[PDB]
């Protein structure tokens, strides 16, 4: 299957700032939660989405929300000297993770994978962007100048990338996520942001 990447970035492609949780957004995280958790419901088997994340992202999730509930969590660590729990998967790279997933949630598993999301960080976003299977980007554009030291690795919303990465209509975004979404800029605590969906032909 295809890989989807989900990210909240500023206009200048800034992903993270100097402190922890540089941008505080309860309605925006709720969107992250619903998109990453939305699955169809079948009577004979269980459907779950997978979230792929790097070790720093894993370590950033408050304890009461970790592992991400109702989703299959996979943490990418090379020097795996991480004490992960029971039910949490770990892989050395993204291709190794995909390998483990198709071997684990196969034909005989009662748990079947729905969608696969790459949730960061920037080293994992870099690897995904280079993956033949990445064809969609779920992006939340923050219309603010936050000091960031970490940027998104490809300026996919720029002119330079327009014949490769296309911004879908709002209605296709709503159809993919399975819910109507507010159009235009949303203000949340002095922050203006907008939801977008970009795809690439494979
Ligand atoms: N759109 C978007 N917004 C984000 O905040 C985001 N965050 C990450 C990485 N960081 C994080 C950090 C915390 C949680 C988190 O707490 N998730 C909970 C909901 C928390 C809540 O409701 O308060 C979850 O269950 O998804 C997720 C991702 C990656 N892509 C993103 N993409």
Swiss-Prot record:
Alphabetized PANTHER family for the sequence: DIHYDROFOLATE REDUCTASE
Pfam family, one: DHFR_1
Entry's EC annotation: 1.5.1.3
Biological classification of the source: Eukaryota, Fungi, Dikarya, Ascomycota, Taphrinomycotina
Protein name: Dihydrofolate reductase
Pathway: Cofactor biosynthesis; tetrahydrofolate biosynthesis; 5,6,7,8-tetrahydrofolate from 7,8-dihydrofolate: step 1/1
Protein keywords: NADP, One-carbon metabolism, Oxidoreductase
GO biological process, one term: one-carbon metabolic process
Residues that, per the record, bind substrate: 28-33, 71
PROSITE patterns for the chain: DHFR_1, DHFR_2
Cell division is among the record's keywords: no
One GO MF term: dihydrofolate reductase activity
GO-annotated cellular components: mitochondrion
InterPro entries for this protein: DHFR (IPR012259), DHFR-like_dom_sf (IPR024072), DHFR_CS (IPR017925), DHFR_dom (IPR001796)
Superkingdom assignment: Eukaryota
Catalytic activity from the UniProt record: (6S)-5,6,7,8-tetrahydrofolate + NADP(+) = 7,8-dihydrofolate + NADPH + H(+)
First-tier enzyme category under EC: oxidoreductase
Residues reported in the UniProt entry to bind NADP(+): 8, 14-20, 55-57, 77-79, 120-127
Keyword NADP appears in the UniProt entry: yes
DHFR domain segment(s): 2-200
């Amino acid at each position: 299957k295809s890989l989807t990447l989900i990210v909240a970035l500023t206009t200048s492609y800034g992903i993270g700032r100097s402190n922890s949780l540089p941008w505080k957004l309860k309605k925006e995280i709720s969107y992250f939660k619903r998109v990453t958790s939305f699955v169809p419901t079948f009577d004979s088997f269980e459907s779950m989405n997978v979230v792929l994340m790097g070790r720093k992202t894993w370590e950033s999730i408050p304890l009461q929300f970790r592992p991400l509930k109702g989703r299959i969590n996979v943490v990418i660590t090379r020097n795996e000297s991480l004490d992960l729990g029971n039910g949490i998967h770990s892989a050395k790279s993204l291709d190794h993770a995909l390998e483990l997933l198709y071997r684990t949630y196969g034909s005989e598993s009662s748990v079947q994978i729905n969608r696969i999301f790459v949730i960061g960080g920037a080293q994992l976003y870099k690897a995904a962007m280079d993956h033949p299977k990445l064809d969609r980007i779920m992006a939340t554009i923050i219309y603010k100048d936050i000091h960031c030291d970490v940027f998104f690795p490809l300026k996919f919303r720029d002119k330079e990338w327009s014949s490769v990465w296309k911004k879908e209509k709002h209605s296709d975004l709503e159809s993919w996520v399975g819910t109507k979404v507010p159009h235009g800029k949303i203000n949340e605590d002095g922050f203006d942001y907008e939801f977008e969906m970009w795809t690439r032909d494979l």
